Amino acid sequence: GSPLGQDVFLDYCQKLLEKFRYPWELMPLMYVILKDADANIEEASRRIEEGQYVVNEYSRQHNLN
Amino acid sequence: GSPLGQDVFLDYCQKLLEKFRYPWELMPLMYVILKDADANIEEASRRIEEGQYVVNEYSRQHNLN
């Protein structure tokens, strides 16, 4: 019923958290992102990445001049 | 999206960013979360919430504060 399945989950977060070196308070975010990407960092990172670029891109196109 | 497919998306993001008062640098995260919750803040917030509690909870059992 509840093996490491959860522990690993937080472990990936700490890793996704390390991959993006996010602060310790964004664990709830890293946590959800993985909940969607089946918890697969490689599959979860591709989202954040697009996100980082996505958001940044939205900032490049507009350059907030 | 070219029409109101992406813009709305960032709108929810900025809103989710406001609902949780997250800094402006977590738009890539608020962005992904919405990507999983059909972009519906209500369905997306429920995850974060469980997340905040989830992580916080994991912080109580082990007592990390």
**For the domain that residue B46 is a member of, what is the CATH number?**
1.10.8.10
Q: Tokens 């109580």 appear where?
A: B60
Contact A36, B35 (CB under 8 A): yes
| Tokens found for residue A65 | 């001049």
What was the structure determination method? NMR
Alpha-carbon span B11 to A48, nearest angstrom: 17
Judged by a CB distance cut-off of 8 A, whether residue B17 touches chain A is: no
CA A11 to chain CA mean position, Å = 12
Question: How many domains are contained in chain B?
Answer: 1
Judged by a CB distance cut-off of 8 A, whether residue A60 touches chain B is: no
List Cβ<8 Å contacts ≥24 apart for B27-30: B27/A51, B27/A55, B28/A48, B28/A51, B28/A52, B28/A54, B28/A55, B29/A22, B29/A26, B29/A29, B29/A30, B29/A33, B29/A48, B29/A51, B30/A29
Q: Is A22 helix (H, G, I), strand (E, B) or coil?
A: coil
End-to-end CA distance of chain B: 43
Which of A10, A13, A32 lies closest to B48 in CB terms? Answer: A32
Judged by a CB distance cut-off of 8 A, whether residue A55 touches chain B is: yes
A27-36 vs A4-19: helix axis angle to the nearest 10? 110
What separation in angstroms does the CA of B64 have from each of A55, B42, B56, B59? 33, 29, 9, 5
Return the number of other C-beta atoms located less than 10 Å from residue B34's C-beta. Answer: 25
Domain hosting residue B38, numbered range: 1-65
Phi, psi values for residue A12, rounded to 5°: -55, -45
